[PDB]
């Protein structure tokens, strides 16, 4: 079994059904015994939903899914009539994602879209999407910049879209953090999660688009 398949059979057999808070939590407890991934709701998570409630949003787009972590952590939050949309290339990845959507009963508000994002993104519009008010960009960070020309270019940033993007603690080709920081189109705000220590464990930036041209 892959890791992701492993994660999955983990919350099956200790998670609460239809409780993503215990999923959440065993996700998370299970990835920081394995050293996976250390204590990703305090890594994360808490930036996570801090950021989605500030701005309650009503279309969320995720680029990127592994395990459907990032997927109920956000969807968990969501109002009535909001959705999220994750779109991933990877079936597999994708697979488990919706498992674990649905083990946690929050199928209702997701649509994953399974495919490449070059391929993907300049359909959004079939969706029914005019323009998206947050955008998760998970792990695959040399991703990031290409992702976010391409929203720009198919109209789905407005005055007001957060981009938030993990995992982005180290200089990458393509740079995601000097093409906003550079930008006067977005404003950005980092967020360095230290847990106990003094090293980074994780990296996210929240960037907002000012608005097209
Ligand atoms: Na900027």
Redesign the pocket.
């Known amino acids: 079994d892959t890791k992701e398949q492993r994660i999955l059979r983990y919350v099956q057999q200790h998670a609460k059904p239809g409780d993503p808070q215990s999923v959440l939590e065993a996700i998370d407890t299970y990835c920081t015994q394995k050293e996976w991934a250390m204590n990703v709701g305090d890594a994360k998570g808490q930036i996570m939903d801090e950021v989605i409630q500030e701005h309650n949003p009503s279309l969320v787009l995720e680029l990127g899914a592994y395990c459907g972590y990032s997927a109920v952590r956000m969807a968990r939050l969501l109002s009535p009539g909001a959705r999220l949309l994750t779109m991933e290339k990877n079936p597999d990845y994708a697979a488990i994602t919706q498992q674990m959507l649905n083990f946690a009963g929050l199928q209702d508000k997701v649509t994953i879209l399974i495919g490449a994002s070059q391929d993907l993104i300049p359909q959004l519009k079939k969706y029914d999407v005019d323009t998206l008010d947050l955008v998760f960009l998970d792990h695959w960070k040399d991703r990031y910049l290409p992702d976010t020309i391409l929203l720009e270019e198919c109209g789905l940033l407005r005055k007001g879209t957060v981009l938030l993007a993990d995992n982005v603690i180290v200089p990458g080709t393509p740079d995601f953090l000097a093409y906003?920081?550079?930008?006067?189109?977005?404003?950005?705000t980092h967020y360095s999660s230290y847990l106990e220590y003094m090293k980074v464990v994780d990296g996210l930036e929240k960037?907002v688009y000012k608005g097209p041209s």
Not at 180 to 188: A, I, K, L
Request: with cysteine; charged share 20%.
């Open positions: 906003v920081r550079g930008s006067s189109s977005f404003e950005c960037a």
